[PDB]
């Protein structure tokens, strides 16, 4: 498993991801991670990116998601289907994604993770995703299209 659901009252209230040996989950989502190894990790806050982060146990580091900042124009993959990337913006069809999908990872066609979905914009025919990704220098940046709402 690469993505781990976060349970608050027995329902999934978000998802935590492990990328490059570090685990990330939405800052606004409360609850336990449904994983005995990950549920015991004390995470640090990063208000810049609206996420919490920390290291994972040595046994998990060997099979974590691969970081990449290589974002050429085209389509990207995620749990609910395909993701279109144009004009440095990530969008998906209307009706795909909503409350409880926060923290899900988006991957390219090479299996590398490009962004963590924290929210999005509900438009007339499409949606724009509020995600944390990396710029051309490989430095973490938060992507918040106008009108973004946390999921």
């Amino acid at each position: 498993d690469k993505t781990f659901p976060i349970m608050l009252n027995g329902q999934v209230n978000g998802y935590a991801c492990v990328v490059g040996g570090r685990v990330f989950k939405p800052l606004h989502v409360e609850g336990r991670i449904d994983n005995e190894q990950l549920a015991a990790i004390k995470l640090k806050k990063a208000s810049i990116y609206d996420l919490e982060y920390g290291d994972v146990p040595q046994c998990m580091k060997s099979d974590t998601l691969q970081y990449t900042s290589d974002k050429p124009p085209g389509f990207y993959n995620w749990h609910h289907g395909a993701v279109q990337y144009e004009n440095n913006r990530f969008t998906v069809p209307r009706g795909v994604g909503g409350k409880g999908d926060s923290g899900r990872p988006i991957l390219d066609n090479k299996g590398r993770v490009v962004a963590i979905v924290l929210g999005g914009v509900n438009e007339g025919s499409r949606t724009a995703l509020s995600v944390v990704t990396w710029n051309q220098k490989g430095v973490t940046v938060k992507d918040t299209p106008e009108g973004s709402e946390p999921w």
Binding site: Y67, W134, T140
Partner: peptide, 14 residues
């Protein structure tokens, strides 16, 4: 914290 964090979350960074 604010200056370094952008690089903590990106191991493959300049």
């Amino acid at each position: 914290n604010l200056c370094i964090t952008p690089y903590k979350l990106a191991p493959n960074a300049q």
